[PDB]
Write a protein that binds this ligand. Structure first.
Ligand SMILES: *[C@@H]1O[C@H](CO)[C@@H](O)[C@H](O)[C@H]1NC(C)=O
Lengths: 48, 49
């Protein structure tokens, strides 16, 4: 019973990760923040 | 001159870089392109289009 529960939990974890494009938001926020900071730094060159 | 690091002055657009043949397709009124961060990345030659 414990082995079956463990296997089912692992399968459900994979399914939850696959079918939810918001679980990994913590890394996505860091990537977006770095990219946006670089974009703002570059765009600051076009100011008099 | 292409494929070399050379200055350019294309219709008042001045800069330094390497000019290569591109696969982009400007509309027949645009003179030069830009990137997402407002950086010059492509130019239409005024004598060969
Ligand atoms: C005059 O302009 C046309 C259009 O750009 C170009 O094809 C032609 O070569 C020009 N004449 C020159 C550069 O002698």
């Amino acid at each position: 019973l414990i082995a079956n529960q463990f296997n089912s939990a692992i399968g459900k974890i994979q399914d939850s990760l696959s079918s939810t494009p918001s679980a990994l938001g913590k890394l996505q926020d860091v990537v977006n923040q770095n990219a946006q900071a670089l974009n703002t730094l570059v765009k600051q060159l076009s100011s008099n | 001159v292409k494929n070399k690091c050379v200055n350019f002055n294309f219709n008042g657009l001045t800069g330094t870089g390497v000019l290569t043949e591109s696969n982009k397709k400007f509309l027949p009124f645009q003179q030069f392109g830009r990137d997402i961060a407002d950086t010059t990345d492509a130019v239409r030659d005024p004598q060969t289009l």
